[PDB]
Amino acid sequence: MEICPAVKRDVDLFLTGTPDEYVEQVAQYKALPVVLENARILKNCVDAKMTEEDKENALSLLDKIYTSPLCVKMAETCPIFYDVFFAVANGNELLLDLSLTKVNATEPERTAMKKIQDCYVENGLISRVLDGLVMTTISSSKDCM
Amino acid sequence: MEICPAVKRDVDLFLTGTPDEYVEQVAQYKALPVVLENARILKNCVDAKMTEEDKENALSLLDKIYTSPLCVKMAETCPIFYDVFFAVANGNELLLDLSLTKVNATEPERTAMKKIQDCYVENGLISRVLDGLVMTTISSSKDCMG
């Protein structure tokens, strides 16, 4: 089924918003200090690592995900998105690559998504993140039924 | 005004990242082979010369900078940071000490910052192309907008 619009919006803000806008949006879902600290580290990392072009290529890849039959025609909500997201958040390059092929990623699109994954990996942030906490809270929210 | 987050990130990586993490981050801004080579010499020196306590003390000092009125309340981006950073990179001990006094550095904080300065000096990197170029390019990046 198609992704919850609020999830799509979070990811779009993550990539394109200012750090303050992204974090204040995360805080509406989960206001734990550690979650907001991690969110800001991750956001600053993606902003610094990704060029405008990289961000464009990530947005094109996400659109391939959101329109894929592996997202929309499935019984539950956009399953391929979550597979991608959690491969990113946990630094699983193999699973990320397997999932990207499924949506016909170009090489620059793969490059861009790997930059996001690198930002989770960087400086040991993969060991810290509560992956699933924010995403679970958005995806199970009343606005997502 | 507050420092650009890309600048704070560059310094945090410099201190706490692996050498590869730091040098690669440098290469995202300036991929001249001389710059990358010089960055790696500097990073290996700071890792070998600074203990964990030294790194903790550099980080606490940098937090004093980033929250100082001489950073935040000024009209342009974090001026006291730049004064400190460039004093460190070009081995000006006098300006470093004066600038560390303006942010109420402790002695451990001062010791730690002088070790970073020593890594620029002892390795010959004052008269080498490195952090003038790199720091100018981060601070003027579209991300910082500067």
PDB file of C-alpha atoms in Angstrom:
ATOM      1  CA  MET A   1       0.000   0.000   0.000  1.00  0.00           C
ATOM      2  CA  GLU A   2       1.271   3.522  -0.518  1.00  0.00           C
ATOM      3  CA  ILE A   3       3.449   5.021   2.199  1.00  0.00           C
ATOM      4  CA  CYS A   4       1.886   7.124   4.888  1.00  0.00           C
ATOM      5  CA  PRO A   5       2.180  10.746   3.765  1.00  0.00           C
ATOM      6  CA  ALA A   6       3.608  11.745   7.171  1.00  0.00           C
ATOM      7  CA  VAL A   7       6.486   9.260   6.687  1.00  0.00           C
ATOM      8  CA  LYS A   8       7.155  10.604   3.173  1.00  0.00           C
ATOM      9  CA  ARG A   9       7.141  14.152   4.679  1.00  0.00           C
ATOM     10  CA  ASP A  10       9.606  13.232   7.416  1.00  0.00           C
ATOM     11  CA  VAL A  11      12.061  11.824   4.976  1.00  0.00           C
ATOM     12  CA  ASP A  12      11.648  14.817   2.623  1.00  0.00           C
ATOM     13  CA  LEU A  13      12.364  17.195   5.542  1.00  0.00           C
ATOM     14  CA  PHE A  14      15.357  15.065   6.564  1.00  0.00           C
ATOM     15  CA  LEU A  15      16.873  15.636   3.162  1.00  0.00           C
ATOM     16  CA  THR A  16      15.675  19.172   2.316  1.00  0.00           C
ATOM     17  CA  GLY A  17      14.760  21.067   5.461  1.00  0.00           C
ATOM     18  CA  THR A  18      17.048  23.036   7.717  1.00  0.00           C
ATOM     19  CA  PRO A  19      18.427  21.084  10.690  1.00  0.00           C
ATOM     20  CA  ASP A  20      16.213  23.077  13.061  1.00  0.00           C
ATOM     21  CA  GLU A  21      13.084  22.350  11.008  1.00  0.00           C
ATOM     22  CA  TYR A  22      13.822  18.605  10.779  1.00  0.00           C
ATOM     23  CA  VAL A  23      14.595  18.189  14.484  1.00  0.00           C
ATOM     24  CA  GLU A  24      11.606  20.220  15.642  1.00  0.00           C
ATOM     25  CA  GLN A  25       9.437  17.965  13.376  1.00  0.00           C
ATOM     26  CA  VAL A  26      11.064  14.814  14.910  1.00  0.00           C
ATOM     27  CA  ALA A  27      10.321  16.215  18.399  1.00  0.00           C
ATOM     28  CA  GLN A  28       6.552  16.283  17.680  1.00  0.00           C
ATOM     29  CA  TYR A  29       6.737  12.488  17.442  1.00  0.00           C
ATOM     30  CA  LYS A  30       9.453  11.631  20.010  1.00  0.00           C
ATOM     31  CA  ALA A  31      10.963  14.282  22.234  1.00  0.00           C
ATOM     32  CA  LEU A  32      13.557  12.168  24.074  1.00  0.00           C
ATOM     33  CA  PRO A  33      16.812  14.172  24.380  1.00  0.00           C
ATOM     34  CA  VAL A  34      18.887  11.292  22.941  1.00  0.00           C
ATOM     35  CA  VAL A  35      16.575  11.015  19.936  1.00  0.00           C
ATOM     36  CA  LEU A  36      16.847  14.770  19.210  1.00  0.00           C
ATOM     37  CA  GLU A  37      20.618  14.717  19.688  1.00  0.00           C
ATOM     38  CA  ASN A  38      20.973  11.812  17.273  1.00  0.00           C
ATOM     39  CA  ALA A  39      18.589  13.325  14.819  1.00  0.00           C
ATOM     40  CA  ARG A  40      20.621  16.512  14.666  1.00  0.00           C
ATOM     41  CA  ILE A  41      23.960  14.657  14.294  1.00  0.00           C
ATOM     42  CA  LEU A  42      22.531  12.587  11.487  1.00  0.00           C
ATOM     43  CA  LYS A  43      20.980  15.594   9.728  1.00  0.00           C
ATOM     44  CA  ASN A  44      24.154  17.696   9.940  1.00  0.00           C
ATOM     45  CA  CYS A  45      26.070  14.705   8.514  1.00  0.00           C
ATOM     46  CA  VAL A  46      23.769  14.252   5.551  1.00  0.00           C
ATOM     47  CA  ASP A  47      23.717  17.991   4.814  1.00  0.00           C
ATOM     48  CA  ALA A  48      27.524  18.123   4.816  1.00  0.00           C
ATOM     49  CA  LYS A  49      28.180  14.866   2.915  1.00  0.00           C
ATOM     50  CA  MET A  50      25.543  15.150   0.245  1.00  0.00           C
ATOM     51  CA  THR A  51      25.802  17.638  -2.615  1.00  0.00           C
ATOM     52  CA  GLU A  52      22.682  19.225  -4.140  1.00  0.00           C
ATOM     53  CA  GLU A  53      23.035  16.580  -6.833  1.00  0.00           C
ATOM     54  CA  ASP A  54      23.260  13.748  -4.299  1.00  0.00           C
ATOM     55  CA  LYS A  55      20.082  15.046  -2.629  1.00  0.00           C
ATOM     56  CA  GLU A  56      18.329  15.152  -6.004  1.00  0.00           C
ATOM     57  CA  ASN A  57      19.370  11.578  -6.740  1.00  0.00           C
ATOM     58  CA  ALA A  58      18.147  10.425  -3.272  1.00  0.00           C
ATOM     59  CA  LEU A  59      14.775  12.131  -3.927  1.00  0.00           C
ATOM     60  CA  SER A  60      14.553  10.399  -7.358  1.00  0.00           C
ATOM     61  CA  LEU A  61      15.347   7.048  -5.769  1.00  0.00           C
ATOM     62  CA  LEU A  62      12.765   7.566  -3.057  1.00  0.00           C
ATOM     63  CA  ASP A  63      10.194   8.287  -5.754  1.00  0.00           C
ATOM     64  CA  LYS A  64      11.077   4.985  -7.431  1.00  0.00           C
ATOM     65  CA  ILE A  65      10.429   3.322  -4.066  1.00  0.00           C
ATOM     66  CA  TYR A  66       7.138   5.112  -3.454  1.00  0.00           C
ATOM     67  CA  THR A  67       5.851   4.141  -6.938  1.00  0.00           C
ATOM     68  CA  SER A  68       7.200   0.584  -7.053  1.00  0.00           C
ATOM     69  CA  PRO A  69       4.753  -2.365  -7.117  1.00  0.00           C
ATOM     70  CA  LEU A  70       6.877  -3.670  -4.231  1.00  0.00           C
ATOM     71  CA  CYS A  71       5.515  -0.668  -2.317  1.00  0.00           C
ATOM     72  CA  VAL A  72       2.039   0.115  -3.613  1.00  0.00           C
ATOM     73  CA  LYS A  73       0.525  -3.207  -4.667  1.00  0.00           C
ATOM     74  CA  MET A  74       1.424  -4.997  -1.468  1.00  0.00           C
ATOM     75  CA  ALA A  75      -1.086  -5.754   1.267  1.00  0.00           C
ATOM     76  CA  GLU A  76       0.732  -3.713   3.929  1.00  0.00           C
ATOM     77  CA  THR A  77       2.253  -0.289   3.910  1.00  0.00           C
ATOM     78  CA  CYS A  78       5.185   0.293   1.400  1.00  0.00           C
ATOM     79  CA  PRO A  79       7.262  -2.710   2.496  1.00  0.00           C
ATOM     80  CA  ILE A  80      10.239  -1.978   0.250  1.00  0.00           C
ATOM     81  CA  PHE A  81      10.595   1.473   1.856  1.00  0.00           C
ATOM     82  CA  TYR A  82      11.010   0.010   5.301  1.00  0.00           C
ATOM     83  CA  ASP A  83      13.494  -2.646   4.030  1.00  0.00           C
ATOM     84  CA  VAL A  84      15.558   0.196   2.525  1.00  0.00           C
ATOM     85  CA  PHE A  85      15.262   2.459   5.529  1.00  0.00           C
ATOM     86  CA  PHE A  86      16.315  -0.195   8.053  1.00  0.00           C
ATOM     87  CA  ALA A  87      19.202  -1.392   5.834  1.00  0.00           C
ATOM     88  CA  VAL A  88      20.322   2.270   5.783  1.00  0.00           C
ATOM     89  CA  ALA A  89      19.921   2.754   9.562  1.00  0.00           C
ATOM     90  CA  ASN A  90      21.853  -0.390  10.438  1.00  0.00           C
ATOM     91  CA  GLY A  91      24.668  -0.062   7.906  1.00  0.00           C
ATOM     92  CA  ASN A  92      23.718  -3.234   6.041  1.00  0.00           C
ATOM     93  CA  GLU A  93      25.227  -2.442   2.671  1.00  0.00           C
ATOM     94  CA  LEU A  94      24.355  -5.845   1.167  1.00  0.00           C
ATOM     95  CA  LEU A  95      20.646  -5.617   1.963  1.00  0.00           C
ATOM     96  CA  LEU A  96      20.573  -1.978   0.903  1.00  0.00           C
ATOM     97  CA  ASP A  97      22.093  -2.907  -2.474  1.00  0.00           C
ATOM     98  CA  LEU A  98      19.654  -5.870  -2.927  1.00  0.00           C
ATOM     99  CA  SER A  99      16.691  -3.583  -2.265  1.00  0.00           C
ATOM    100  CA  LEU A 100      17.945  -0.823  -4.532  1.00  0.00           C
ATOM    101  CA  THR A 101      18.265  -3.168  -7.486  1.00  0.00           C
ATOM    102  CA  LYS A 102      14.651  -4.097  -6.976  1.00  0.00           C
ATOM    103  CA  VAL A 103      13.621  -0.506  -7.694  1.00  0.00           C
ATOM    104  CA  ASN A 104      15.991  -0.001 -10.657  1.00  0.00           C
ATOM    105  CA  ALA A 105      18.384   2.378  -8.932  1.00  0.00           C
ATOM    106  CA  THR A 106      20.951   4.114 -11.073  1.00  0.00           C
ATOM    107  CA  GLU A 107      24.553   4.272  -9.875  1.00  0.00           C
ATOM    108  CA  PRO A 108      24.341   7.959  -8.745  1.00  0.00           C
ATOM    109  CA  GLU A 109      21.131   7.029  -6.866  1.00  0.00           C
ATOM    110  CA  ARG A 110      22.966   4.145  -5.125  1.00  0.00           C
ATOM    111  CA  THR A 111      25.813   6.536  -4.322  1.00  0.00           C
ATOM    112  CA  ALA A 112      23.475   8.974  -2.700  1.00  0.00           C
ATOM    113  CA  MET A 113      21.716   6.407  -0.574  1.00  0.00           C
ATOM    114  CA  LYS A 114      25.055   4.967   0.550  1.00  0.00           C
ATOM    115  CA  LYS A 115      25.989   8.500   1.758  1.00  0.00           C
ATOM    116  CA  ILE A 116      22.972   8.403   4.049  1.00  0.00           C
ATOM    117  CA  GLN A 117      23.992   4.971   5.244  1.00  0.00           C
ATOM    118  CA  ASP A 118      27.535   6.232   5.801  1.00  0.00           C
ATOM    119  CA  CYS A 119      26.112   8.957   8.061  1.00  0.00           C
ATOM    120  CA  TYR A 120      24.517   6.292  10.285  1.00  0.00           C
ATOM    121  CA  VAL A 121      27.827   4.379  10.317  1.00  0.00           C
ATOM    122  CA  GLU A 122      29.981   7.442  10.922  1.00  0.00           C
ATOM    123  CA  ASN A 123      31.573   8.024  14.299  1.00  0.00           C
ATOM    124  CA  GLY A 124      29.792   4.965  15.661  1.00  0.00           C
ATOM    125  CA  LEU A 125      26.266   6.442  15.357  1.00  0.00           C
ATOM    126  CA  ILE A 126      24.867   2.985  14.299  1.00  0.00           C
ATOM    127  CA  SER A 127      25.637   1.793  17.879  1.00  0.00           C
ATOM    128  CA  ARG A 128      23.677   4.675  19.375  1.00  0.00           C
ATOM    129  CA  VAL A 129      20.549   5.122  17.215  1.00  0.00           C
ATOM    130  CA  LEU A 130      17.286   3.771  18.499  1.00  0.00           C
ATOM    131  CA  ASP A 131      16.384   2.695  14.977  1.00  0.00           C
ATOM    132  CA  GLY A 132      12.758   2.109  14.659  1.00  0.00           C
ATOM    133  CA  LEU A 133      11.729   4.445  17.504  1.00  0.00           C
ATOM    134  CA  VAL A 134      10.920   7.564  15.474  1.00  0.00           C
ATOM    135  CA  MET A 135       9.893   5.598  12.398  1.00  0.00           C
ATOM    136  CA  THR A 136       7.614   3.293  14.413  1.00  0.00           C
ATOM    137  CA  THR A 137       6.070   6.282  16.082  1.00  0.00           C
ATOM    138  CA  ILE A 138       5.327   8.109  12.851  1.00  0.00           C
ATOM    139  CA  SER A 139       4.157   4.954  11.015  1.00  0.00           C
ATOM    140  CA  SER A 140       1.779   3.836  13.782  1.00  0.00           C
ATOM    141  CA  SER A 141       0.396   7.319  14.409  1.00  0.00           C
ATOM    142  CA  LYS A 142      -3.262   8.218  14.131  1.00  0.00           C
ATOM    143  CA  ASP A 143      -2.433  10.374  11.087  1.00  0.00           C
ATOM    144  CA  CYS A 144      -1.174   7.181   9.412  1.00  0.00           C
ATOM    145  CA  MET A 145      -4.518   5.322   9.446  1.00  0.00           C
TER     146      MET A 145
ATOM    147  CA  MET B   1      26.214  34.358  15.253  1.00  0.00           C
ATOM    148  CA  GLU B   2      26.275  30.573  15.772  1.00  0.00           C
ATOM    149  CA  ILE B   3      28.912  28.611  13.931  1.00  0.00           C
ATOM    150  CA  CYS B   4      27.923  26.774  10.832  1.00  0.00           C
ATOM    151  CA  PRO B   5      27.069  23.138  11.751  1.00  0.00           C
ATOM    152  CA  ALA B   6      29.371  21.840   8.917  1.00  0.00           C
ATOM    153  CA  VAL B   7      32.250  23.601  10.650  1.00  0.00           C
ATOM    154  CA  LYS B   8      31.475  22.157  14.053  1.00  0.00           C
ATOM    155  CA  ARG B   9      31.162  18.706  12.412  1.00  0.00           C
ATOM    156  CA  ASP B  10      34.540  19.059  10.698  1.00  0.00           C
ATOM    157  CA  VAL B  11      36.212  19.767  14.043  1.00  0.00           C
ATOM    158  CA  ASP B  12      34.323  17.022  15.847  1.00  0.00           C
ATOM    159  CA  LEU B  13      35.459  14.496  13.201  1.00  0.00           C
ATOM    160  CA  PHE B  14      38.979  15.829  13.309  1.00  0.00           C
ATOM    161  CA  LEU B  15      39.089  15.082  17.033  1.00  0.00           C
ATOM    162  CA  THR B  16      36.843  11.961  17.401  1.00  0.00           C
ATOM    163  CA  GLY B  17      36.626  10.330  13.999  1.00  0.00           C
ATOM    164  CA  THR B  18      38.923   7.738  12.613  1.00  0.00           C
ATOM    165  CA  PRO B  19      41.634   9.048  10.305  1.00  0.00           C
ATOM    166  CA  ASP B  20      39.688   7.715   7.315  1.00  0.00           C
ATOM    167  CA  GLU B  21      36.477   9.351   8.490  1.00  0.00           C
ATOM    168  CA  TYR B  22      38.218  12.696   8.866  1.00  0.00           C
ATOM    169  CA  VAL B  23      40.263  12.630   5.636  1.00  0.00           C
ATOM    170  CA  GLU B  24      37.307  11.532   3.570  1.00  0.00           C
ATOM    171  CA  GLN B  25      35.274  14.348   5.036  1.00  0.00           C
ATOM    172  CA  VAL B  26      38.026  16.698   4.028  1.00  0.00           C
ATOM    173  CA  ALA B  27      38.003  15.248   0.526  1.00  0.00           C
ATOM    174  CA  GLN B  28      34.271  16.094   0.194  1.00  0.00           C
ATOM    175  CA  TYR B  29      35.362  19.784   0.318  1.00  0.00           C
ATOM    176  CA  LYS B  30      38.836  19.757  -1.242  1.00  0.00           C
ATOM    177  CA  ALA B  31      40.243  16.795  -3.034  1.00  0.00           C
ATOM    178  CA  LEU B  32      43.735  18.118  -3.859  1.00  0.00           C
ATOM    179  CA  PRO B  33      46.153  15.355  -3.118  1.00  0.00           C
ATOM    180  CA  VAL B  34      48.453  17.681  -1.119  1.00  0.00           C
ATOM    181  CA  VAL B  35      45.514  18.720   1.113  1.00  0.00           C
ATOM    182  CA  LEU B  36      44.519  15.089   1.788  1.00  0.00           C
ATOM    183  CA  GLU B  37      48.098  14.048   2.482  1.00  0.00           C
ATOM    184  CA  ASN B  38      48.555  16.991   4.929  1.00  0.00           C
ATOM    185  CA  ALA B  39      45.247  16.319   6.592  1.00  0.00           C
ATOM    186  CA  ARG B  40      46.288  12.710   7.293  1.00  0.00           C
ATOM    187  CA  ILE B  41      49.648  13.757   8.826  1.00  0.00           C
ATOM    188  CA  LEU B  42      47.826  16.197  11.077  1.00  0.00           C
ATOM    189  CA  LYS B  43      45.103  13.750  12.107  1.00  0.00           C
ATOM    190  CA  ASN B  44      47.605  10.956  12.850  1.00  0.00           C
ATOM    191  CA  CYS B  45      49.593  13.447  14.985  1.00  0.00           C
ATOM    192  CA  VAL B  46      46.556  14.594  16.992  1.00  0.00           C
ATOM    193  CA  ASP B  47      45.447  10.967  17.636  1.00  0.00           C
ATOM    194  CA  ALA B  48      48.990   9.978  18.801  1.00  0.00           C
ATOM    195  CA  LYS B  49      49.671  13.158  20.825  1.00  0.00           C
ATOM    196  CA  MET B  50      46.209  13.540  22.514  1.00  0.00           C
ATOM    197  CA  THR B  51      44.822  11.152  25.157  1.00  0.00           C
ATOM    198  CA  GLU B  52      41.108  10.619  25.630  1.00  0.00           C
ATOM    199  CA  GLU B  53      41.201  13.198  28.453  1.00  0.00           C
ATOM    200  CA  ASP B  54      42.952  15.664  26.121  1.00  0.00           C
ATOM    201  CA  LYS B  55      40.233  15.102  23.473  1.00  0.00           C
ATOM    202  CA  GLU B  56      37.515  15.547  26.136  1.00  0.00           C
ATOM    203  CA  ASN B  57      39.137  18.806  27.207  1.00  0.00           C
ATOM    204  CA  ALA B  58      39.360  20.114  23.561  1.00  0.00           C
ATOM    205  CA  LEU B  59      35.701  19.326  23.140  1.00  0.00           C
ATOM    206  CA  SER B  60      34.715  21.129  26.348  1.00  0.00           C
ATOM    207  CA  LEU B  61      36.718  24.155  25.274  1.00  0.00           C
ATOM    208  CA  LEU B  62      35.139  24.140  21.853  1.00  0.00           C
ATOM    209  CA  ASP B  63      31.754  24.080  23.548  1.00  0.00           C
ATOM    210  CA  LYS B  64      32.780  27.198  25.492  1.00  0.00           C
ATOM    211  CA  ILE B  65      33.612  28.867  22.148  1.00  0.00           C
ATOM    212  CA  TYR B  66      30.401  27.894  20.412  1.00  0.00           C
ATOM    213  CA  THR B  67      28.291  29.253  23.308  1.00  0.00           C
ATOM    214  CA  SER B  68      30.402  32.363  24.040  1.00  0.00           C
ATOM    215  CA  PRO B  69      28.835  35.835  23.436  1.00  0.00           C
ATOM    216  CA  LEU B  70      32.009  36.535  21.445  1.00  0.00           C
ATOM    217  CA  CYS B  71      30.752  33.819  19.096  1.00  0.00           C
ATOM    218  CA  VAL B  72      26.987  34.026  19.201  1.00  0.00           C
ATOM    219  CA  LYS B  73      26.190  37.643  19.865  1.00  0.00           C
ATOM    220  CA  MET B  74      28.424  39.058  17.136  1.00  0.00           C
ATOM    221  CA  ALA B  75      27.084  40.141  13.811  1.00  0.00           C
ATOM    222  CA  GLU B  76      28.985  37.620  11.705  1.00  0.00           C
ATOM    223  CA  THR B  77      29.584  33.907  12.149  1.00  0.00           C
ATOM    224  CA  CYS B  78      31.363  32.825  15.394  1.00  0.00           C
ATOM    225  CA  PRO B  79      34.362  35.191  15.176  1.00  0.00           C
ATOM    226  CA  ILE B  80      36.173  33.887  18.269  1.00  0.00           C
ATOM    227  CA  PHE B  81      36.200  30.373  16.792  1.00  0.00           C
ATOM    228  CA  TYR B  82      38.039  31.540  13.718  1.00  0.00           C
ATOM    229  CA  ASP B  83      40.528  33.497  15.824  1.00  0.00           C
ATOM    230  CA  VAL B  84      41.297  30.359  17.838  1.00  0.00           C
ATOM    231  CA  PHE B  85      41.275  27.995  14.906  1.00  0.00           C
ATOM    232  CA  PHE B  86      43.701  30.065  12.820  1.00  0.00           C
ATOM    233  CA  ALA B  87      45.973  30.778  15.761  1.00  0.00           C
ATOM    234  CA  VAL B  88      46.164  27.007  16.254  1.00  0.00           C
ATOM    235  CA  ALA B  89      46.797  26.241  12.582  1.00  0.00           C
ATOM    236  CA  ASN B  90      49.513  28.802  12.039  1.00  0.00           C
ATOM    237  CA  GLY B  91      51.277  28.308  15.401  1.00  0.00           C
ATOM    238  CA  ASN B  92      50.552  31.721  16.893  1.00  0.00           C
ATOM    239  CA  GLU B  93      50.885  30.830  20.601  1.00  0.00           C
ATOM    240  CA  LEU B  94      50.283  34.414  21.817  1.00  0.00           C
ATOM    241  CA  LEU B  95      47.019  34.895  20.004  1.00  0.00           C
ATOM    242  CA  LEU B  96      45.898  31.403  21.010  1.00  0.00           C
ATOM    243  CA  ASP B  97      46.499  32.113  24.693  1.00  0.00           C
ATOM    244  CA  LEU B  98      44.786  35.507  24.546  1.00  0.00           C
ATOM    245  CA  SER B  99      41.779  34.035  22.737  1.00  0.00           C
ATOM    246  CA  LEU B 100      41.533  31.062  25.143  1.00  0.00           C
ATOM    247  CA  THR B 101      41.450  33.611  28.060  1.00  0.00           C
ATOM    248  CA  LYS B 102      38.437  35.364  26.441  1.00  0.00           C
ATOM    249  CA  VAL B 103      36.444  32.072  26.748  1.00  0.00           C
ATOM    250  CA  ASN B 104      37.619  31.185  30.313  1.00  0.00           C
ATOM    251  CA  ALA B 105      39.627  28.134  29.273  1.00  0.00           C
ATOM    252  CA  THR B 106      40.799  25.876  32.131  1.00  0.00           C
ATOM    253  CA  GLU B 107      44.444  24.847  32.210  1.00  0.00           C
ATOM    254  CA  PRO B 108      43.621  21.317  30.962  1.00  0.00           C
ATOM    255  CA  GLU B 109      41.689  22.937  28.084  1.00  0.00           C
ATOM    256  CA  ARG B 110      44.656  25.152  27.279  1.00  0.00           C
ATOM    257  CA  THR B 111      47.077  22.145  27.401  1.00  0.00           C
ATOM    258  CA  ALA B 112      44.878  20.169  25.042  1.00  0.00           C
ATOM    259  CA  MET B 113      44.566  23.047  22.497  1.00  0.00           C
ATOM    260  CA  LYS B 114      48.331  23.617  22.541  1.00  0.00           C
ATOM    261  CA  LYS B 115      48.864  19.917  21.631  1.00  0.00           C
ATOM    262  CA  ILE B 116      46.771  20.474  18.483  1.00  0.00           C
ATOM    263  CA  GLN B 117      48.854  23.613  17.749  1.00  0.00           C
ATOM    264  CA  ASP B 118      52.034  21.608  18.287  1.00  0.00           C
ATOM    265  CA  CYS B 119      50.886  19.085  15.658  1.00  0.00           C
ATOM    266  CA  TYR B 120      50.687  21.880  13.074  1.00  0.00           C
ATOM    267  CA  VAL B 121      54.090  23.315  14.146  1.00  0.00           C
ATOM    268  CA  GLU B 122      56.257  20.162  14.687  1.00  0.00           C
ATOM    269  CA  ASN B 123      55.151  18.686  11.362  1.00  0.00           C
ATOM    270  CA  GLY B 124      56.007  21.817   9.335  1.00  0.00           C
ATOM    271  CA  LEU B 125      52.371  22.505   8.470  1.00  0.00           C
ATOM    272  CA  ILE B 126      52.267  26.262   9.245  1.00  0.00           C
ATOM    273  CA  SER B 127      53.677  27.028   5.765  1.00  0.00           C
ATOM    274  CA  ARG B 128      51.665  24.280   4.085  1.00  0.00           C
ATOM    275  CA  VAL B 129      48.393  24.392   2.253  1.00  0.00           C
ATOM    276  CA  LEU B 130      45.789  22.887   4.513  1.00  0.00           C
ATOM    277  CA  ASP B 131      43.271  24.408   6.879  1.00  0.00           C
ATOM    278  CA  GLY B 132      43.267  27.953   5.493  1.00  0.00           C
ATOM    279  CA  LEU B 133      41.902  26.445   2.283  1.00  0.00           C
ATOM    280  CA  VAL B 134      39.752  23.720   3.856  1.00  0.00           C
ATOM    281  CA  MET B 135      38.225  25.944   6.583  1.00  0.00           C
ATOM    282  CA  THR B 136      37.546  28.769   4.110  1.00  0.00           C
ATOM    283  CA  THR B 137      35.808  26.310   1.828  1.00  0.00           C
ATOM    284  CA  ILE B 138      33.614  24.724   4.508  1.00  0.00           C
ATOM    285  CA  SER B 139      32.635  28.086   6.019  1.00  0.00           C
ATOM    286  CA  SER B 140      31.716  29.525   2.613  1.00  0.00           C
ATOM    287  CA  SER B 141      29.867  26.406   1.419  1.00  0.00           C
ATOM    288  CA  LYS B 142      26.277  26.606   0.299  1.00  0.00           C
ATOM    289  CA  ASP B 143      25.452  24.526   3.394  1.00  0.00           C
ATOM    290  CA  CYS B 144      26.763  27.329   5.611  1.00  0.00           C
ATOM    291  CA  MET B 145      25.704  29.795   2.913  1.00  0.00           C
ATOM    292  CA  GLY B 146      28.552  31.951   3.890  1.00  0.00           C
TER     293      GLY B 146
END
